[PDB]
Design a protein around this motif. Structure first.
Motif, PDB file in Angstrom:
ATOM      1  N   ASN A  70       9.830   6.634  10.713  1.00  0.00           N
ATOM      2  CA  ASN A  70       8.603   6.127  11.313  1.00  0.00           C
ATOM      3  C   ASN A  70       8.667   4.616  11.510  1.00  0.00           C
ATOM      4  O   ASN A  70       8.392   4.104  12.610  1.00  0.00           O
ATOM      5  N   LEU A  94       1.728   8.774   1.060  1.00  0.00           N
ATOM      6  CA  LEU A  94       2.035  10.117   0.587  1.00  0.00           C
ATOM      7  C   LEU A  94       3.484  10.478   0.839  1.00  0.00           C
ATOM      8  O   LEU A  94       4.042  11.339   0.154  1.00  0.00           O
ATOM      9  N   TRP A  95       4.093   9.867   1.841  1.00  0.00           N
ATOM     10  CA  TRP A  95       5.338  10.398   2.354  1.00  0.00           C
ATOM     11  C   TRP A  95       6.513  10.012   1.469  1.00  0.00           C
ATOM     12  O   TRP A  95       6.492   8.994   0.775  1.00  0.00           O
ATOM     13  N   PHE A 155       0.838  -1.186   0.000  1.00  0.00           N
ATOM     14  CA  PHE A 155       0.000   0.000   0.000  1.00  0.00           C
ATOM     15  C   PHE A 155       0.877   1.241   0.000  1.00  0.00           C
ATOM     16  O   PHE A 155       1.698   1.441   0.897  1.00  0.00           O
TER      17      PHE A 155
END
Lengths: 49, 49
Positions: free
Chosen positions: B48, B39-40, B36
């Motif tokens: 993260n 945006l990053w 999936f």
């Protein structure tokens, strides 16, 4: 946080200018020009609105 | 009535050797979930993770 990352999207950011003279002028037929009516309503000390 | 022959002597029984069996099982490995996209960019998602 994972549900956020799934539901994250690219936003469409649209600006729009609202001129209140056009808004109060373009109405139903009980409408008015903003400048003269504000000038009269602040000049006169009457109930009128 | 005392017998002239002497009585035979018994041989004691053989003890059992208790033995345990240790076996292992094979559970199947898990595959991957679906890719999936987000945006990053790379370093923020890297930190993260």
């Amino acid at each position: 946080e994972d549900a956020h990352l799934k539901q994250e999207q690219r936003a469409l950011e649209v600006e729009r200018t609202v001129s209140l003279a056009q808004v109060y002028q373009s109405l139903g037929e009980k409408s008015f020009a903003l400048k003269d009516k504000i000038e009269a309503l602040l000049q006169g000390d009457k109930e009128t609105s | 009535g005392q017998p002239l022959h002497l009585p035979i002597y018994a041989t004691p029984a053989d003890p059992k050797a208790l033995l345990s069996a240790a076996v292992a099982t094979s559970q199947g490995g898990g595959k991957l979930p679906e890719s999936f996209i987000s945006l990053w960019r790379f370093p923020h998602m890297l930190e993260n993770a």
